[PDB]
């Protein structure tokens, strides 16, 4: 019957879900649980590099809050 | 971790292409009152694997090509570019977050014509060359409408960034304000990928250019061709059927976005089973006399419509 | 009597002309064709599950030639050669001589199943229901020489398919 | 001009000036088997199975043409019930041929789906062949004198159940082709034949009726009981592929109309002429009566003698006018048997019909002529 | 593990792939081509076995000769056979192709296609039923299943 | 409601073949898991089933034996394994087993 | 560096499949087998090129709509598209878009 066509669709459907699911998880793993920063324009890049210097550890995604201010 | 990311994109693409062959053979079967593969594995789930092994242990021809170096360059270029067109796709986060991603996909897509042209030369057959020339003239003709239609849509979006199309459709699908463009974009994607009713290459009784290829080299052209069918339908869903993105639950986007991308890929198989084939002079007239006049007119309309409503999108 | 197939004059009123403009621009009759293929997607396919299911046949089916016996075990053929005379392909070869007990019996009966056109004239000509075409249609071979039947192969077929051959002849001999 | 020997059972030698076809040169004979010479070493009954294999899509209509010719030289008449059977299966054969003609005409130009829907109908009609004769295709069921056997009980009910639903199958076929703009573009104003060129080139069948010529042998020179049934002859107006496609689709409907009358007006009686010097006796009376054994012996070894003479007999076969110029010398074996295949003259007009058309149109023009090379080459 | 054990299982993997994906090139010459179309029709649906309906000569694994081979056609047949990439099998369908059949004694007919090309399976009948050709195809699958190419190379 | 009944029949095929193991055995040998009425068994082990709700052509099928004449037929089934007495019923040349 | 790795992986992968495709069956040992310029096609390519170049001048339109001179910008945008349509009309009427000899 027609529903015997679905199992092929499920495999094809799952294979198109892995690339999207993998990229989202790998970014969070590599960016300390946050989305990967988006820097399309020079101003955004300048802030990101500044965050690298302010973190102490040379990482753009380690955010320092008020507790870092005297 | 980025290298792991690339493999998490490439292998699933090839597996999806492998099982698209099965799904195509079974959807076509049921629309023809039959079943399709259901013997090689349960419901034909091992049919793709059998076909792959068979082709890769079958002796290849490699005739007396005029070059013998274009014969090996053509499938490398086809498959190499086909996988490259996936790296900027937001699903919902791109592997490579390009600022001009929409323009990157046009650029790489226009290079796929060389593999059609080079394989024509390598075959060394005068007739096989004629088939390559007709295929090339078809591809370049219909990417005129891909470029202008895309420009018209981006006038309602404001950038060439692919992830900005997600923001643009955060209140409503672009299929609603731009359905006339969606129609001519959908048909223009069939012609680009040599799909019925535009498959003169595979349309025997008039000609294909990849006729001298067998075994593994033939499968490489096949894999690239089908990966482009999935990619163009993923592009269409992003462009005209935007899926809402929740930053806390990105998997929700991927499931909804995949279902749309599958439904549009099955529409390609649906259209193959329903219509006869265009004549070469008739698909050219469908472009130079019907689509192009409307595409140019709609481009004028979409340059002016945002201005006269005060609806110009932000640059950023 | 006769009828015209393509002799209609399309109306030229505004509503009719606009109807064909919507059809041209909105692809109405093409989407009408997509719906028909969609309906077949939800119909039960007509495929049968061969080899576990078989296609229906009838008692008159013409398959593998065979030589029959009387209920006593004596051969029905009496070397009359009517089948050899009527065979349009000249696929039958026969030789006969008096048997040890004096009966008129063959010493050769060959059918070339590659000359044969499976026409059934051999079993119409036979006056004693000796040469018949049975119901077996699955007897493909791997070599050309296995399809040149001799009297031993044909008598083995008759003993092998007698149970089904007799029942078919019982079901159809009233039409012959 | 560029020349292509497309080759392989048709070898086409064409010269093309770019996209246009400047000349078409069909090379045939790749299926010539010497049928007409073999018929001269056979009795009239032994040559009957050859005609199933000429136009192997319309098997039972080639038997009828050969049977009409022999019955004419014999000066005998088939019994009324046999004639009604020979019309019932003549129209069933006409459904088999038009499905093959239309659906393989559409499959060669891309539309592959209607082929599978309608070949499930052909399969069911192959059971009607198999239930009367025992063979799906080459029945050899129609013979000089009538038909070999009588219909088995219950077959006419199964023919009725099939015919009841067929008209719906045609409608689904027309939902895919008739109004589809892609189909029309491939078949409209393609291969236009003038009503005067068609007659002078030897055309017959829908090749004439497509150009407005009102001609059908079933109505003008009837045979068997075609003058006791009601049907309409489709007629074209533009003489192109599209009009000829509509004539075959509409002839499938007029066959269902004839079949509905054969099932209701089928008389009782015997199914072969009651003259045992032409048609063999019953097996029951062949095993009890001396004359019936003598006549069975001679009919299956020597065959019946046919008085000297020659005849040209023709029918309205599915593909056009099919006939034989049968010549007799007064013995059991025919002297000469020429076969007139409608596709022989139709394919000789391919060069004329393909002037000023593209190469891809030659595919459609070959399809619209409904060519089967079993009859073209013999 | 033994070498004779790995080769036995590798032989089963290549045989399984080859017999499960037979792509035929059909030489439809005469009436036997009609019965071959009914094998692709919905009733039997060759495609559900992995046997595609139509394949080009260079993408094909089996040649089905369905009809009468004439003397004007024989050179074309041999040319197509020589251009088939290996492994390649030939199925002879019908009396005409097997031995000439009804036209055996004709001046223009090759008496059997097996004197022009090698033949693996002979399917008898005039024509064979669509269920008889299908039985022959499944008999070619089992023949490919018995191949022992690797088990004979290992013993050279 | 009718959606529910479809799933119920899908489950009752698993129980109608003797659990999962029997259900999988007929899914890999026959590629079909329908359940029919047993009509009989021949001396070689073949089992014959009928289901008259199925459309003509699928209403009779045979599940071949796993061994015949000393040959392992678990995977290598063959249509010529049907003996003549059942060859007539299975091909619908008669209505009487 | 990321975009460079992505391109390297895709084309490196394609090359591997190609070479192992031409060699894996050659691990097998099969017996050795032994043994017009068209003008209209050229005009399609040239027409595409001139149309393709005019598209290059239209791609920056989305950024051009962000200016404070919309009256001037909208005048030239409709001029380029109108001129592109004039080229199509000229070829159409001069039988450029035909495939019949
Ligand atoms: C190698 C095998 C053959 C590959 C053919 C395909 C070429 C890839 C296209 C070039 C990359 C590109 O398009 O950049 C767009 C994109 C455009 O992205 P963007 O404009 O959005 O900017 C990205 C960064 N922001 C947004 C922050 C400004 O380029 C990049 O993203 C990064 C640029 C990296 C530059 C390194 C290029 C070196 C490789 C070029 C040589 C290619 C040789 C080709 C050999 C001949 C074959 C044609
Ligand atoms: C005519 C033949 C060719 C036509 C091709 C038709 C196939 C293309 C798909 C058309 C159907 C649209 C997809 C419906 C299934 C999508 C499932 C899904 O994403 O969630 C439901 C989606 C959920 O919406 P969403 O997640 O996509 O977000 C909507 C975005 N806003 C909020 C801006 C509108 O909604 C539906 O599509 C219901 C229908
Ligand atoms: C207030 C301001 C409003 C401004 C905008 C107003 C717009 C008004 C509407 C304008 C018309 C709409 C444009 C529609 C496109 C017309 C293109 C055209 O050329 O038509 C004629 C063309 C051809 O027309 P023709 O062949 O019949 O003849 C042309 C003219 N003569 C007769 C002179 C030759 O139609 C086609 O494109 C053929 C279709 C090929 C087969 C395609 C298969 C369709 C499968 C269904 C897909 C459904 C779409 C899926 C979309 C999914 C997207 C996610
Ligand atoms: C991604 C594509 C590339 C894949 C690379 C290769 C690795 C993939 C392995 C996949 C193996 C699939 C084999 C499945 C066989 C099967 O399903 O049963 C068939 C058959 C099923 O029966 P059947 O097919 O013979 O019968 C069919 C007819 N009916 C329907 C009646 C049953 O089972 C067999 O008996 C065949 C035995 C095959 C044994 C294969 C063992 C391989 C072991 C690995 C070898 C070393 C690897 C290196
Ligand atoms: C990418 C996805 C596809 C991946 C492909 C996976 C394939 C998995 C199986 C690979 C191993 C089998 C390939 C070699 C089989 C070749 C063959 O069938 O013939 C054996 C061949 C036959 O050689 P031969 O010595 O018997 O005879 C050759 C010369 N003739 C024929 C003329 C007599 O032997 C081999 O070369 C096998 C080498 C060992 C393989 C390990
Ligand atoms: C079968 C009948 C229908 C026919 C088939 C239809 C097409 C196939 C279905 C579409 C493709 C979807 C393929 C993926 C489905 C299986 C995966 C899934 O359902 O979602 C799992 C997802 C994983 O969870 P995860 O991302 O790890 O969250 C961790 C948070 N700390 O969990 C989530 O987070 C989800 C939110
Ligand atoms: C409501 C009010 C609406 C406005 C009124 C409607 C517009 C009127 C003009 C429409 C009719 C056009 C003239 C025409 O009929 O052209 C037909 C002709 C087709 O000829 P052909 O196809 O070769 O014939 C084949 C026969 N076998 O074609 C020709 O011969 C030439 C056709 C050239 C078409 C050029 C297309 C490019 C222009 C695209 C539109 C872009 C906008 C142009 C700028 C507008 C500025 C305001
Ligand atoms: C608007 C709806 C009313 C209408 O169309 O007019 C109806 C009117 C009555 O119909 P009728 O008697 O047939 O008159 C036509 C005889 N020449 O018919 C008329 O006479 C009305 C005037 C006829 C001329 C109108 C031409 C209309 C086509 C112009 C192009 C319209 C383009 C619209 C945009 C298309 C894209 C969506
Ligand atoms: C269902 C699953 C089973 C199916 C088969 C799939 C199996 C998955 C594995 C296949 C791919 C092979 C394994 C991947 C090897 C990648 C090598 C690697 O780890 O990366 C090292 C190298 C450069 O990477 P990196 O060190 O990060 O350089 C950054 C400098 N700033 O990397 C490179 O230089 C790139 C070299 C090109 C990529 C190699 C070819 C990939 C295709 C094989
Ligand atoms: C705005 C322009 C509006 C006019 C559009 C003209 C192009 C339309 C296609 C031409 C079809 C036509 O109507 O006939 C053109 C006519 C041809 O000559 P004819 O004798 O009538 O017939 C053919 C004989 N061989 O005569 C011609 O061929 C002349 C037209 C072809 C050359 C195009 C000229 C366009 C004018 C420029 C318009 C844009 C203004 C640019 C200003 C920039 C100044 C630097
Ligand atoms: C590299 C390409 C593959 C080479 C295979 C090979 O050389 O594999 C050799 C080994 C065993 O070695 P051996 O007994 O010396 O066989 C050498 C070959 N002879 C005996 C024919 C000379 O094969 C296996 O165990 C299984 C191989 C999988
Ligand atoms: S079926 Fe016909 S051709 Fe075959 S052996 Fe019998 S009489 Fe001869
Ligand atoms: S017709 Fe019958 S009895 Fe006479 S030779 Fe032939 S098989 Fe024997
Ligand atoms: S074997 Fe029979 S059906 Fe096949 S081509 Fe020859 S005569 Fe025709």
UniProtKB/TrEMBL annotation, chain G:
Main subcellular location: mitochondrion
Catalytic activity, reaction form: a ubiquinone + NADH + 5 H(+)(in) = a ubiquinol + NAD(+) + 4 H(+)(out)
GO cellular component entries: mitochondrial inner membrane; respiratory chain complex I
Transmembrane segments: 41-61, 73-90
GO function term, MF aspect, one: NADH dehydrogenase (ubiquinone) activity
Subcellular location: Mitochondrion inner membrane; Mitochondrion membrane
Database matches in InterPro entries: NADH_UbQ/plastoQ_OxRdtase_su3 (IPR000440), NDAH_ubi_oxred_su3_sf (IPR038430)
Membrane topology: Multi-pass membrane protein
Single GO BP term: mitochondrial electron transport, NADH to ubiquinone
EC number: 7.1.1.2
Keywords annotated in UniProt: Electron transport, Membrane, Mitochondrion, Mitochondrion inner membrane, NAD, Oxidoreductase, Respiratory chain, Translocase, Transmembrane, Transmembrane helix, Transport, Ubiquinone
Quaternary data: Core subunit of respiratory chain NADH dehydrogenase (Complex I) which is composed of 45 different subunits. Interacts with TMEM186. Interacts with TMEM242.
Similarity section: Belongs to the complex I subunit 3 family.
Function: Core subunit of the mitochondrial membrane respiratory chain NADH dehydrogenase (Complex I) which catalyzes electron transfer from NADH through the respiratory chain, using ubiquinone as an electron acceptor. Essential for the catalytic activity of complex I.
Protein name as it appears in the record: NADH-ubiquinone oxidoreductase chain 3
Organism of derivation: Bos taurus (Bovine)
Underlying gene: ND3
């Amino acid at each position: 019957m027609w529903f015997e066509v679905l199992p092929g669709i499920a495999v094809m459907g799952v294979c198109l879900f892995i690339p999207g699911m993998a990229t989202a998880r790998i970014h969070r793993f590599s960016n300390g649980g946050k989305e990967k920063r988006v820097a399309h324009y020079p101003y955004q890049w300048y802030l990101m590099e500044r965050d690298r210097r302010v973190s102490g550890v040379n990482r753009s995604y380690v955010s320092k809050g008020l507790e870092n201010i005297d | 971790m980025f290298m792991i990311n690339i493999l998490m994109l490439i292998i699933p693409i090839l597996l999806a292409v492998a099982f698209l062959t099965l799904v195509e053979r079974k959807v076509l079967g049921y629309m023809q009152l039959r079943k399709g593969p259901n013997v090689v594995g349960p419901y034909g789930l091992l049919q793709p694997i059998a076909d792959a092994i068979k082709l890769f242990i079958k002796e290849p021809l490699r005739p007396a090509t005029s070059s013998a170096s274009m014969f090996i360059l053509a499938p490398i270029m086809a498959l190499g570019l086909a996988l490259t067109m996936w790296i900027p796709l937001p699903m919902p986060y791109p592997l490579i977050n390009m600022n001009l991603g929409v323009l990157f996909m046009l650029a790489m897509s226009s290079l796929a014509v060389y593999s059609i042209l080079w394989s024509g030369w390598a075959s060394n057959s005068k007739y096989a060359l004629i088939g390559a020339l007709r295929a090339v003239a078809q591809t370049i003709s219909y990417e005129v409408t891909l470029a202008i239609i895309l420009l018209s849509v981006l006038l309602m979006s404001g950038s060439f960034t692919l992830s900005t199309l997600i923001t643009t459709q955060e209140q409503m699908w672009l299929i609603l304000p731009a359905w006339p463009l969606a129609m001519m974009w959908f048909i223009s994607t069939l012609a680009e990928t040599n799909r019925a009713p535009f498959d003169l290459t595979e349309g025997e009784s008039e000609l294909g250019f990849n006729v001298e290829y067998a075994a593994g080299p033939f499968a490489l052209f096949f894999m690239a061709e089908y990966a482009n069918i999935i990619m163009m339908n993923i592009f269409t869903a992003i462009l005209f059927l935007g899926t809402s993105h929740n930053p806390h639950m990105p998997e929700l986007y991927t499931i909804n976005f995949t279902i749309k991308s599958l439904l549009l890929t099955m529409s390609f198989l649906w259209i193959r089973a329903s219509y006869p084939r265009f004549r070469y002079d008739q698909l050219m007239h469908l472009l130079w006399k019907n689509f192009l006049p409307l595409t140019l007119a709609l481009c004028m309309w979409h340059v002016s419509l945002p201005i006269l409503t005060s609806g110009i999108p932000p640059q950023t | 009597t006769y009828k015209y197939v393509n002799l209609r004059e399309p109306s030229m009123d505004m509503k009719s002309v606009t109807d064909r403009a919507a059809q041209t621009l909105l692809w109405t009759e093409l989407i009408r064709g997509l719906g028909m293929t969609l309906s077949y997607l939800f119909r039960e396919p007509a495929t049968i599950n061969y080899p576990f299911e078989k296609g229906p046949l009838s008692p008159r089916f013409r398959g593998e030639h065979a030589l029959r016996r009387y209920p006593s075990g004596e051969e029905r053929c009496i070397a009359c050669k009517l089948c050899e005379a009527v065979c349009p392909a000249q696929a039958i070869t026969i030789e006969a001589e008096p048997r040890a007990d004096g009966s008129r019996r063959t010493t050769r009966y060959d059918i070339d199943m590659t000359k044969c056109i499976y026409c059934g004239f051999c079993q119409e000509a036979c006056p004693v229901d000796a040469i018949v075409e049975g119901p077996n249609f699955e007897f493909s071979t791997e070599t050309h020489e296995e399809l040149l039947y001799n009297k031993e192969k044909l008598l083995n077929n008759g003993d092998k398919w007698e149970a089904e051959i007799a029942a078919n002849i019982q079901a159809d001999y009233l039409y012959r | 001009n560029l020349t292509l020997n497309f080759g392989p059972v048709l070898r086409l030698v064409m010269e093309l000036s770019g996209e246009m076809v400047r000349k078409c040169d069909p090379h045939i004979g790749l299926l010539h088997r010497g049928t007409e010479k073999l018929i001269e070493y056979k009795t009239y009954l032994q040559a009957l199975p050859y005609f199933d294999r000429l136009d192997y899509v319309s098997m039972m209509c080639n038997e009828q043409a050969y049977s009409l010719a022999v019955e004419k030289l014999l000066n005998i008449r088939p019994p009324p019930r046999a004639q009604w059977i020979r019309v019932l299966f003549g129209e069933i054969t006409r459904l088999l041929n038009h499905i093959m003609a239309v659906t393989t005409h559409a499959l060669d130009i891309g539309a592959m789906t209607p082929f599978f829907w309608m070949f499930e109908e052909r399969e069911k009609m192959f059971e009607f062949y198999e239930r009367v004769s025992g063979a799906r295709m080459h029945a050899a069921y129609v013979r000089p004198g009538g038909v070999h056997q009588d219909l088995p009980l219950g077959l006419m009910d199964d023919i009725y159940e099939f015919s009841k639903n067929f008209s719906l199958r045609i409608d689904e076929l027309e939902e895919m082709l008739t109004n589809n703009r892609i189909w029309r573009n491939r078949t409209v104003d393609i291969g236009i034949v003038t009503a005067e060129d068609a007659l002078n080139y030897g055309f017959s069948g829908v090749m004439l009726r497509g150009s407005g010529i009102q001609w059908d042998l079933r109505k003008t020179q009837p045979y068997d009981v075609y003058d006791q049934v009601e049907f309409d002859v489709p007629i074209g107006s533009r003489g192109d592929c599209y009009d000829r496609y509509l004539c075959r689709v509409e002839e499938m409907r007029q066959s269902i109309r004839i079949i509905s009358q054969c099932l209701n007006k089928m008389p009782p009686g015997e199914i072969k002429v009651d003259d045992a010097k032409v048609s063999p006796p019953k097996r029951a009376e062949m095993k009890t009566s001396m004359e019936s054994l003598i006549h069975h012996f001679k009919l299956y070894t020597e065959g019946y003698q046919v008085p000297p003479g020659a005849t040209y007999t023709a029918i309205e076969a599915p593909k056009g006018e099919f006939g034989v110029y049968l010549v007799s010398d007064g013995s059991s074996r025919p002297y000469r048997c020429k076969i007139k295949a409608p596709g022989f003259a139709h394919l000789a007009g391919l060069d004329k019909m393909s002037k000023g058309h593209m190469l891809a149109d030659v595919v459609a023009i070959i399809g619209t002529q409904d060519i089967v090379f079993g009859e073209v080459d013999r | 593990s033994r070498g004779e054990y790995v080769v036995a299982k590798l032989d089963d993997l290549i045989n399984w792939a080859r017999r499960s994906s037979l792509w035929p090139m059909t030489f439809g010459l005469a009436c036997c081509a009609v019965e071959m179309m009914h094998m692709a029709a919905p009733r039997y649906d060759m495609d559900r076995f992995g046997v595609v309906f139509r394949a080009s000569p260079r993408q094909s694994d089996v040649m089905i000769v369905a009809g009468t081979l004439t003397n004007k056609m024989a050179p074309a047949l041999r040319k197509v056979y020589d251009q088939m990439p290996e492994p390649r099998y030939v199925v002879s369908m019908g009396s005409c192709a097997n031995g000439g059949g009804y036209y055996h004694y004709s001046y223009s007919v090759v008496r059997g296609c097996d004197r022009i090309v090698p033949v693996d399976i002979y399917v008898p009948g005039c024509p064979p039923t669509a269920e008889a050709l299908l039985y022959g195809i499944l008999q070619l699958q089992k023949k490919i299943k018995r191949e022992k190419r690797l088990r004979i190379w290992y013993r050279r | 409601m009718e959606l529910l009944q479809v799933l119920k029949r899908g489950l009752q095929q698993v129980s109608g073949h003797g659990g999962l193991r029997g259900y999988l055995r007929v899914l890999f040998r026959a590629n079909d898991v329908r359940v029919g009425t047993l009509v009989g068994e021949d001396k070689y082990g073949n089992k014959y089933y009928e289901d008259n709700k199925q459309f003509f052509g699928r209403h009779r099928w045979v599940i071949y034996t796993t061994e015949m004449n000393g040959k392992n037929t678990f995977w290598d089934v063959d249509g010529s394994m049907v003996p003549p007495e059942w060859h007539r019923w299975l091909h619908c040349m008669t209505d009487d087993p | 560096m990321n975009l460079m790795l992505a391109l390297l992986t895709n084309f490196t992968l394609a090359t591997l499949l190609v070479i192992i495709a031409f060699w894996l069956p050659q691990l097998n040992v099969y017996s050795e087998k032994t043994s017009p310029f068209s003008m209209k096609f050229f005009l399609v390519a040239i027409t595409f090129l001139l149309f393709d170049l005019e598209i290059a001048l239209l791609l920056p339109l989305p950024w051009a709509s962000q200016t404070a001179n919309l009256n001037t910008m909208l005048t030239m945008a409709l001029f380029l598209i109108i001129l592109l349509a004039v080229s199509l009309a000229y070829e159409w009427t001069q039988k450029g878009l035909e495939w019949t000899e």
